[PDB]
Amino acid sequence: MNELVDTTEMYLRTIYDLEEEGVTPLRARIAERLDQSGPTVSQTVSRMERDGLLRVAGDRHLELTEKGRALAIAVMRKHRLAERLLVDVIGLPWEEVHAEACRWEHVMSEDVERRLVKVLNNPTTSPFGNPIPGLVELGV
Ligand SMILES: [Zn+2]
Ligand SMILES: [Zn+2]
């Protein structure tokens, strides 16, 4: 746990970020970013390779497989959906929201999200400008 309440989803997510930052998904990054040691991140990656979420191409840079980009895009939609909820509705301070949504993202349901895509006034960008991926594939 530890706010990284779901490693599998965190790894996948962090790559969505590295790609969104316009940077290279180097294991050095995911290890530092998540406070995991290299020997374990590769342990996790190989594991996630054996699960069909990622693929280690020539670049050696971990790549999101259709399943990985799938379980990555949704967690980012949940993440961002909660960010709106916390700011717009709950009113948590704008700077505390991220670390909050960073957790709730692993526990929010598609059923809840839809209610949010509805109840919430603007499900286009999360508070920090970021786009809300998956909307179409959510069912809204
Ligand atoms: Zn955030
Ligand atoms: Zn998280």
Q: How was this structure determined?
A: X-ray
Same domain, 64 and 82: no
Q: Which two tokens stand for residue 54?
A: 């990622």
Where in the sequence is the domain holding 114, given as residue range(s)? 76-136
Q: How far is CA 137 from CA 13, 74, 77, 130, in A?
A: 17, 9, 10, 18
18 vs 10: CA distance, rounded Å: 12
CA of 58 to the centre of ligand 1 (A): 31
Contact yes or no for 40/66 (Cβ under 8 A): no
> Which ligand lies nearest to the CA atom of residue 1 in the structure?
2
Same domain, 80 and 131: yes
Same domain, 61 and 122: no
Same domain, 98 and 69: no
CA of 101 to the centre of ligand 2 (A): 7
Q: Which two tokens stand for residue 13?
A: 């997510």
Which residue, of 30, 54, 75, is where some domain finishes? 75
Q: List, as ranges, residues with CB under 5 A of the ion ligand 1.
A: 98
127 vs 103: CA distance, rounded Å: 16
Contact yes or no for 67/52 (Cβ under 8 A): yes
Same domain, 111 and 125: yes
CA of 12 to the centre of ligand 2 (A): 10
104 vs 19: CA distance, rounded Å: 22
Same domain, 56 and 70: yes
Q: Within 13 A of 83's CA, how many CA atoms are on the CB side?
A: 22
Specify the 3-state DSSP secondary structure of 40. Answer: helix
Q: Burial level of 112, CB count in 10 A (0-12/13-18/19+)?
A: middle
Which residue, of 60, 75, 90, is where some domain finishes? 75
Q: 103 Cβ partners below 8 Å, 6+ apart?
A: 3, 5
Same domain, 32 and 87: no
Q: List, as ranges, residues with CB under 5 A of the ion ligand 2.
A: 102
CA of 82 to the centre of ligand 1 (A): 9
CA of 31 to the centre of ligand 2 (A): 15
The domain total for the chain is 2
Identify residue 17 by its one-letter amino acid code. D
Which residue, of 75, 107, 127, is where some domain finishes? 75
CA of 13 to the centre of ligand 2 (A): 8
Contact yes or no for 16/76 (Cβ under 8 A): yes
What does this entry list as its resolution, in Å? 2.6
Residue position matching structure tokens 């970013």: 33
- From the list 23, 44, 7, the residue with the least C-alpha distance to 54 is 44
CATH code of the domain containing 60: 1.10.10.10
